[PDB]
Ligand binder design. Sequence first.
Ligand SMILES: CCCCCCCCCO[C@@H]1O[C@H](CO)[C@@H](O)[C@H](O)[C@H]1O
Ligand SMILES: CCCCCCCCCO[C@@H]1O[C@H](CO)[C@@H](O)[C@H](O)[C@H]1O
Ligand SMILES: CCCCCCCCCO[C@@H]1O[C@H](CO)[C@@H](O)[C@H](O)[C@H]1O
Length: 180
Amino acid sequence: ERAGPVTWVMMIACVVVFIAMQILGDQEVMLWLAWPFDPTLKFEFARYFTHALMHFSLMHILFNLLWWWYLGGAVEKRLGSGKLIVITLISALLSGYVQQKFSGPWFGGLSGVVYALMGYVWLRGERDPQSGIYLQRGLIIFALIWIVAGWFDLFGMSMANGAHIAGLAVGLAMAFVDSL
Ligand SMILES: CCCCCCCCCO[C@@H]1O[C@H](CO)[C@@H](O)[C@H](O)[C@H]1O
Ligand SMILES: CCCCCCCCCO[C@@H]1O[C@H](CO)[C@@H](O)[C@H](O)[C@H]1O
Ligand SMILES: CCCCCCCCCO[C@@H]1O[C@H](CO)[C@@H](O)[C@H](O)[C@H]1O
């Protein structure tokens, strides 16, 4: 059993971008992938999504991809690639929007998407057990530790608490709808 296409391509894309950031520096890559930071860039639509591909430290990308691999992998396998695509697109857009609104356009990473996946997998398992998807009891503990790390700034994740809550809301909302 291996990670599906969406789970896999996202991981490889983030690694490729991370390498580009080490070679060229974070700033040069953000210039091209960050959320629109000037009116001249408002119609470069990829920017409303590409911010999610950038990570700023080894720990940032390491833990984001571990969670994406586990949660996204599970969602794709049991519920399909389409499900993972939508959760990802909606959470990246909303968390990015909230982040930009209160803290500016300079940010990046999959943490908002991870909050969405944590909320989705956990809630789906609590309300729709036989759906096959659930968050392992022990992993609920480490997910909480990861959440706390970012919430109290013990671990730099680029995005702010409000943006992460927005991502979580998307996951919970979709899980609620799916267990309907
Ligand atoms: C604190 C970090 C969070 C815990 C990370 C646990 C990662 C477990 C990865 O498992 C892998 O998941 C793939 C996708 O579902 C399966 O295809 C594969 O067979 C399985 O080996
Ligand atoms: C949204 C990602 C973070 C997960 C949040 C988990 C909620 C707090 C954990 O309390 C709950 O306690 C129950 C009683 O033991 C367990 O059965 C259940 O599994 C567990 O969830
Ligand atoms: C820096 C933190 C690293 C934590 C590493 C924890 C390893 C134990 C987690 O095991 C994983 O549990 C999943 C749920 O049961 C399985 O789906 C998966 O196959 C299995 O690999």
